[PDB]
Design a protein around this ligand. Sequence first.
Ligand SMILES: [Zn+2]
Length: 428
Amino acid sequence: KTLLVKHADVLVTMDDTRRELRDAGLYIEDNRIVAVGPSAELPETADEVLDLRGHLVIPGLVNTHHHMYQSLTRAVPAAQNAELFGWLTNLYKIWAHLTPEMIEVSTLTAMAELLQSGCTTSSDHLYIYPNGSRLDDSIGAAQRIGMRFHASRGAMSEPDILRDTQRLIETYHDEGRYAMLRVVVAPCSPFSVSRDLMRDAAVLAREYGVSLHTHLAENVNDIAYTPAEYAEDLGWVGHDVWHAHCVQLDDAGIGLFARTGTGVAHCPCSNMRLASGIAPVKKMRLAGVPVGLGVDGSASNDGAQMVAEVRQALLLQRVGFGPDAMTAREALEIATLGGAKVLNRDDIGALKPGMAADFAAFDLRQPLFAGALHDPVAALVFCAPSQTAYTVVNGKVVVREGRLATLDLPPVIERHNALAHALVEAAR
Ligand SMILES: [Zn+2]
């Protein structure tokens, strides 16, 4: 099956030479990009053709941290103005009533919000499995909606954790190029499980060639309870590892992550709404640490508009460090190539031959972009956050003219709100 994209106003490839083409497109075979360049230099037709004149086309955005199930409990009254501990104790009273269906529905809802904002690849971090829920429930939802997924097997405490983790890797992990599903070993944090499980997880992961992920140095209490030394000691450093938040990562931790290729998932909005603080991303990048973007759990954001996160990261770094702390293209790179690096994949994040057919298209004719066409690429970050006109994943159109095309979304969200209400009802 061939897919041809032509006449895009601007096409940022994020390729070897960071090309940004005008009046360009892509030639796709099944789920792989075979050709990228000026439209005149590309085939004139394909099985499906998207003439994106008037549009900004970008490689699919990559989300590197989430708690999708939290989409069911957003803006809960007791969580709105609480500090981490109160936020936690109240929300746990609610999450303890989660069901297999809720895990399925919330995954569909969260992925829909991401896809509709330009995000084509996403990981998640489901660390609780109540009332018989399973990672399997999220994976099924991801396969139905069509999002490239990195399903994490999170956990809190133990022997069962490891068996399930292995079961899931063997069942769902696809190490082949263009994989739409991959598994990740992810205990919630080094302080939520024993150091024994932490060591076991690392070896388990390295045995199957999968990645490791967890929360690290997100607040002041974490340090007092260093985090990076603790991580290196447990073997949690390497190209196959990435930690979320790291707002409190010290200079030594940074140097360490940089030399080992250990990644970090920056979540600006969450870091603000929960007041964790400003992570030194300007410093991290200067030090060479691979950084990606994360919307984080919907109970702590509470939105999931990926372009807005890219914008928030740029705005945040600048208020804490100055106008040259981060450029629009830098933010967009972290949201693309950075997310890929962090997930340890080289088959996404860029529009060029041999890469996965994932990309986002934005309509430059919207009023929000009016007067910003002096630099359409920068505009995506400097202007109000835009929804995509089209979202393509694995060569398939998932969002068409702003609508979810892989499934009928309204009944899903109606059910989502109905389950969200029943959930909070059960708790109270
Ligand atoms: Zn998190």
